[PDB]
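Retro notes
What went well: the complex prediction finally ran end to end.
Inputs used:
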Amino acid sequence: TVINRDGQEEKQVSFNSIYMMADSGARGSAAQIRQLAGMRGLMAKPDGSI
Amino acid sequence: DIVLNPLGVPSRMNIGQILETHLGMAAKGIGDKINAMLKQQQEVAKLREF
Amino acid sequence: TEFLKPRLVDIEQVSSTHAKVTLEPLERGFGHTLGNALRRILLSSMPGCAVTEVEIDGVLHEYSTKEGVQEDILEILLNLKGLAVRVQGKDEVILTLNKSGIGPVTAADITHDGDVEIVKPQHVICHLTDENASISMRIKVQRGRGYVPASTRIHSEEDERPIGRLLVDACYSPVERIAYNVEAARVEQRTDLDKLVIEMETNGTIDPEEAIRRAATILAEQLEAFVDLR
Amino acid sequence: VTEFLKPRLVDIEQVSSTHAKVTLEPLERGFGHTLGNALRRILLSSMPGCAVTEVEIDGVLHEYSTKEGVQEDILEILLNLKGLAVRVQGKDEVILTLNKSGIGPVTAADITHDGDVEIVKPQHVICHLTDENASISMRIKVQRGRGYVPASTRIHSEEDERPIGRLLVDACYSPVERIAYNVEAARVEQRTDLDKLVIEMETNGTIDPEEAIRRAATILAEQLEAFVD
Amino acid sequence: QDVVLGLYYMTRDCVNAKGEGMVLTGPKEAERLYRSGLASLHARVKVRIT
Amino acid sequence: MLNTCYRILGLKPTVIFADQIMYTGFAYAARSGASVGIDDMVIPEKKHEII
Amino acid sequence: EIKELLKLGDLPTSGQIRLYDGRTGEQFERPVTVGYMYMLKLNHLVDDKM
Amino acid sequence: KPLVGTGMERAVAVDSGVTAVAKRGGVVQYVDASRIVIKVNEDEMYPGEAGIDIYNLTKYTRSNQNTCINQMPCVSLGEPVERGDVLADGPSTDLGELALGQNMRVAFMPWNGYNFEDSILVSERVVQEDRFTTIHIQELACVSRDTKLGPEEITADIPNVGEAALSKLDESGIVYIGAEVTGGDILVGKVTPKGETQL
């Protein structure tokens, strides 16, 4: 968030909804936003092999 | 008509219910145009073109 | 220092079902205090007329069919509970319908009455697909406010009613959409006054000015518990 | 079809001499939120009254200035004066003065009073003096208005830029300190979806709470007189 | 789940919020200013507290 | 908060305080207006190159 | 394609609008997702279970 | 119908045999709420018989799970029909497509703790337009048997009941068609011979 002030810009914590409910401890975690917006990753076989 | 919680989507990763909600609006918004041209009593060429 | 008072400046009729009203001048912070009160009143408390019972002859319940008529009887009852009618002098009336031939049966075929009128004469009631087919029914219309489902007034009175009188649910309220706006008024001395514009969508069967008068009257009578306390 | 249920103003409860609870029941469904919200929006922004709007101090002319002999900064002195409750009878503008020397608390009971201006609480502390040679003189301005108006809009909706020494105060005109409400369910003998409206009211000692409720009710009821018939 | 989200949204702060800088007499005045539309919930202010 | 209130004051103040917390949390969560959209899920622009 | 069709019907592309509270008439602070969903009544009625 | 589907509803509707599908092309000659009569074309006509198809619809039948099965016609009188076309709809079908629910207007936000954990909050306009109303049909049975003291009888002369409670029965002892019954009412009157009792 680049919100500016009386003279010029600066930074602060985001007001994004998903980040807000993950960071406050209401619902979610980082491991699940990782699958929403990152990549899913490596999958195992039913044997245990990757 | 109905009010649903947003805290249910992130930690369950059923994102398809959001996209559907965005597409079902676009469909309804098209009907409301055609409907208007049948109240407003437009000719057949306008409806054909739209 | 005393407040200015609003006045009902103009009423514009965009259609037979949709209209706009304007109240001005208002002090600062009175477009919302009046706008939301009037929107909450107009949407729940206006009185109107609705269909409450039907009798068709040769019909025992609503899960039957009738020969020559291509709707089930539930669909006919659902088409009838969407009929907009205005009654002049009474709180109850009974209409009749008799039709024969091939074609659609619409609200322009109900028999004429002196002090009852139908605002939409092309509302479709049913269809007749046979040449030797005919329909005849008698419809009861009443006046009230609110929403009363048939499973609640069948418990109002308990005595016997004959087999063949079918109950319909009553939605009495004639107002279906309300919106409003607060704009800057133009008075030549001051610039801290606003106007309030209300947009109304109804089914016929009520006048916008009379509707606003009823809403304001209900609000003013409800405030008397505070204006004179204990 | 036109006869609505009308409530009974039971159970006024006095918590203190300036704090009250009012209960009103029963009401038609959805009328608690009409009445409570319309009444709360008027007690809060349209009540008329009178309050301090600016002060003039000597030698302490700047905003960030410091007088000696006092325990506290002047920024809290401009805060102890918003808690000043006064009744002004007859005029729209009154200017008042105050001065004291010695040791101890500077209260409102030390002000040079008039016959038309009365103070509500003379125990309101305004300053503290820590030295026998310490002194202060001030010229306070008491205007009349309605609602709440801050110092920012006051200072730049106006460019009659006066000589320095005016220190602007936020003006609390309305006598109402706190107003809240909530709606609960009530049951007349066989109907169940009716309301009960409860109102918590707190004002400064100028007027009683019930008188404020009555005056807001009258202000609202007198705006509808062009339509009621 | 929503107690947490509401309490977290009401005790956050923001830069250049409407009504920043004022000095208030207590909690009652802050409430009366938020309900009136003059200040924001995330505004940086100075309050006297017992 | 709830644990220090239980340690200092006791049981009954705690059971009143918990109710008040619940009510005010529900009210201000309602007034916030929190929602979820499709643009709230932001993919970094330098993933396509890490891959 | 969803956003192109939303533009064809004169609707917001982000899929979020401004809503007002019915009980007080105020505005909600942030925009809200509003659309059309498809719902189903399941044969788990409470008349059976009580 | 759904506003957003996947294109797979037509086949599931037709292949379930819950609709009435035309066997031969033609022109609709008679339509009713309970039957349809088709007049076959000349090409598809068999050289030996009249060439008139008759479809008799199903009305308010109960299913294995007490729900209601009911068909209703789509075509109107006098219009052409080809082979394989849908002539009447079954339960949960709209013009030949599977329709399992209704499409509502939703907003995603918290409301005062009424949608707390998977809960749902609904408007009154949804319960007063009858969008989620359903019909249920239920069956009851009265069996008359032999005993060691003689047979039971289904009668209207029920002892020790007021004659108000016998108004809805006909003289044969059975309730009328079209009645409105609530809990406790008598549907079929029956008496059993009784062994003598101590006092």
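What we learned: The radius of gyration of chain B is 17 Å.
What to try next: split runs per interface for comparison.
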